[PDB]
Structure formats: C-alpha cells, structure tokens
Amino acid sequence: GHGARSLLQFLRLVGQLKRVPRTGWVYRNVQRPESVSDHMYRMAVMAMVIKDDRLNKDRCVRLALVHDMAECIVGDIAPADNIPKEEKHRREEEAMKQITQLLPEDLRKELYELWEEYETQSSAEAKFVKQLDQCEMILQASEYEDLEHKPGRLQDFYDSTAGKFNHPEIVQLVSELEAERSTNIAAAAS
Amino acid sequence: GARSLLQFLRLVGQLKRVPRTGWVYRNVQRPESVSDHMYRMAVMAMVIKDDRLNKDRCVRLALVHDMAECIVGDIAPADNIPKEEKHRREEEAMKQITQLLPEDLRKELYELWEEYETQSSAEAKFVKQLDQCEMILQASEYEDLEHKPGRLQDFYDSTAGKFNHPEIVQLVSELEAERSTNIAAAAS
Ligand SMILES: [Mg+2]
Ligand SMILES: [Mg+2]
Ligand SMILES: [Mg+2]
Ligand SMILES: [Mg+2]
C-alpha cells in the first residue's frame, strides 16, 4: 500500500497548513490569527463568486488552492523576514518538488504546473489570483481592526497594496472596503 | 453590487473563526476552523482520482458544503438538533447568504449546497465521504500531537461502515492500520 501511504503523507503535509499562522498577523500581535489554509479557502470562494467570463474559473480556484501550498514546509515567509526573492523561490520550488513527489505522476505534474503558473504571473488566471490574494489580505486586515475596535491599526498592509489592483470586479470590492474603512477612521479620529 | 458582495465575503470570513465543534467538545487545544476543514477536503477532491466523477464539481461542493456554518455555527450530534431542524436552519441560512449575490450566482451557489444536502449525485456522495475521511485524519493528527493515541476513538466509531468509494476506503484502511499500530505500541 505504498500508494495509500504516500497519499496519506501528502495529506498530513497539507494538514500542516492549518497550523501555520499567517505571519503578517502574528508580527502585528493579532490575537488568534488565521491559518494559511483559511486564507486559501476564502480566496477559492472569491474565485467562485467573482464574475469574469474571460477567465477559466476552474483554473482560478485550483490556483488559489495550490499557490501557498509550499508553506507547509517552508513556513509563511514575510517581507519583514528579509529573504531575497530568488532564495524564497528556490525554497518554495524545492518544497513543491518534495510535496508533489508523493503523488501519482499525472497529479504530481498537474499540481506542480499549477504552482509554476502562479509563480510565473503570465496567465490571466494567475494575475487574477494574485489580486485575490492581496484583496483577501486587506479584507482580513479590516476584519481584525474591527474585531479589535482599533480602526486604522493595520494601515501598513493597505499602503503595501497601493496601485496593485486593476481587475474591474476586485477594484469595486476594494473601493467599497476602503470607503467604509477610511470613513470609519475619520469618524474615530473626530 | 459590491457592498453586498463585501458583506457576503465577510460572512464567509466568519468560517475562519468557527472552531470545529467536535474538537472543542474533546478539549483539543487550538482546534481547526471550519474553513481549514473545507480547504483540505477541496485539496483531497483534487488529488483522489476517479475520472467518472466531475472533479470541478467535487471541489466546489467541498467549498460550499459547510458554508451555512458561518451563520448557524458548526452543529454537532452532541447538540441534539433534530435532523429536520438542522436542515431547516441551514437552508434558511443558505438563502440569507446567497441572496447577497447576483441572481445567477445566487441560484448556482444555492443549488450546489442543495445537491450536497440531497446526496443524490455521485459527486455529493463522494464529498460526504471526503468529509468523514478528512475528519478521522484530523482526529489521528490531534492524537499524534498530544501523544495520546486512541483518545479520539469515538470519531472513528462514528464513521463505521460509512465508506465505500474504493480510493477513500484504501486511504481509510491505511490510516486505520497506522493508527492501530501506534495504539498497540502504547498499550504494551
Ligand atoms: Mg505567504
Ligand atoms: Mg497567499
Ligand atoms: Mg459541521
Ligand atoms: Mg464538513
């Protein structure tokens, strides 16, 4: 039963994503921060409910579910960790090779190529998912601010996404989030 | 449009903060969320092979099946909610949740949930087995982390005879054998 054993080892590695807290929240003292799998779950849902008939939605959902999968080995590397982008890529690529080698060859190839597609940021689906990633993050940031009753506290996350959104539907979402958020901050400040 | 979609996504976000109830009831420290549970199920639908199943449908079913819990919470058998009442409450919640979406998506998302609740399609029945399989996998993982093998036996007992898809059966059999070996090692 080497096949079943390998699959089980694969699913245990995947399960480690539940126990990897998202690093940016930890570094900002968020109580009970979300896991990497929480982050990917809402991104996948976003891909299902944001309309764009030019995009292959199935591909978008799968990219969302695979894009941070290397984190079960590498951990969630944050800008504050000061890891060179090429070193981060090397670590993540090596981790993805180790993870996918536990799968039958068709699925090994598929899962790896999906991760590669996201990393490459060429396809429209990959670029769309990158925007979902950033949108999900700033949405989560405002949710923590609200839960804490500390509006504006996580402003650094918003600043870091300046100019990064361009998809028509995502842009409407972010604008509505920012209008609500900025108005709340102004009211709290006065 | 956007304001209601944002409300929808915030509701979906509540799933990150709903701990899976069975683990809470068994004093598991730092239990997984409902969204953690669905995430791994979705990955399982991606990597467990059966070309007679619509895999895209399986993934989507996994992502929607417990979505009503963002409003009603994760109801457990311990909670003693009649099956009919649990369905009534979840149905009500899915209606409330999906009415935040444009007509086409509202219908699509609600019908996905309904397919799962109905358990008619082969995909729905497969995802139901993924649900139970993911659960007992997580139970073994908690036992391992605690170094208390056998402690969460009840979750295994509750799944007895609920598996029949050959790939899922093989995975469950391997899990069971690895676990029982650990339990035997702790016993002597
Ligand atoms: Mg990361
Ligand atoms: Mg991400
Ligand atoms: Mg439940
Ligand atoms: Mg479930």
UniProtKB/Swiss-Prot annotation, chain A:
As to how many cofactors bind and how, the note says: Binds 2 divalent metal cations. Shows activity with Mn(2+), Co(2+) and Mg(2+) but shows no activity with Zn(2+).
Q: Where does a divalent metal cation 1 bind?
A: 39, 67-68, 133
**Function description:** Catalyzes the dephosphorylation of the nucleoside 5'-monophosphates deoxyadenosine monophosphate (dAMP), deoxycytidine monophosphate (dCMP), deoxyguanosine monophosphate (dGMP) and deoxythymidine monophosphate (dTMP).
Report residues binding a divalent metal cation 2.
Answer: 71, 76-77
Provide the assembly information. Answer: Homodimer.
Essential cofactor(s): Mn(2+); Co(2+); Mg(2+)
GO molecular-function term, one example from the UniProt record: metal ion binding
Keyword Kinase included in the entry's annotation = no
SMART domains according to UniProt: HDc
Spell out the Gene3D superfamilies in the cross-references: Hypothetical protein af1432 (1.10.3210.10)
The source's superkingdom equals Eukaryota
| Record keyword Acetylation present | yes
Q: Which reaction does it catalyse?
A: a 2'-deoxyribonucleoside 5'-phosphate + H2O = a 2'-deoxyribonucleoside + phosphate
User: What species is this protein from?
Assistant: Homo sapiens
| Cited PANTHER family | 5'-DEOXYNUCLEOTIDASE HDDC2
Family (UniProt): Belongs to the HDDC2 family.
Keywords, alphabetical = Acetylation, Cobalt, Hydrolase, Magnesium, Manganese, Metal-binding, Phosphoprotein
For this entry, the protein name equals 5'-deoxynucleotidase HDDC2
Domain HD residues, every copy = 36-138
Question: EC number(s) of the enzyme?
Answer: 3.1.3.89
What Pfam families is this protein classified in? Answer: HD_3 (PF13023)
From Swiss-Prot, chain B:
Q: Which InterPro entries match?
A: HD/PDEase_dom (IPR003607), HD_domain (IPR006674), YfbR/HDDC2 (IPR039356)
Keyword Metal-binding annotated: yes
Q: Which cofactor does it need?
A: Mn(2+); Co(2+); Mg(2+)
Listed A to Z, the keywords are: Acetylation, Cobalt, Hydrolase, Magnesium, Manganese, Metal-binding, Phosphoprotein
Residues at which a divalent metal cation 1 binds: 37, 65-66, 131
Q: How is the cofactor bound?
A: Binds 2 divalent metal cations. Shows activity with Mn(2+), Co(2+) and Mg(2+) but shows no activity with Zn(2+).
EC number assigned by the record: 3.1.3.89
| GO MF term set | 5'-deoxynucleotidase activity; metal ion binding
- The positions annotated for binding a divalent metal cation 2 are 69, 74-75
Stated role: Catalyzes the dephosphorylation of the nucleoside 5'-monophosphates deoxyadenosine monophosphate (dAMP), deoxycytidine monophosphate (dCMP), deoxyguanosine monophosphate (dGMP) and deoxythymidine monophosphate (dTMP).
User: What quaternary arrangement does the UniProt entry report?
Assistant: Homodimer.
**Record protein name field:** 5'-deoxynucleotidase HDDC2
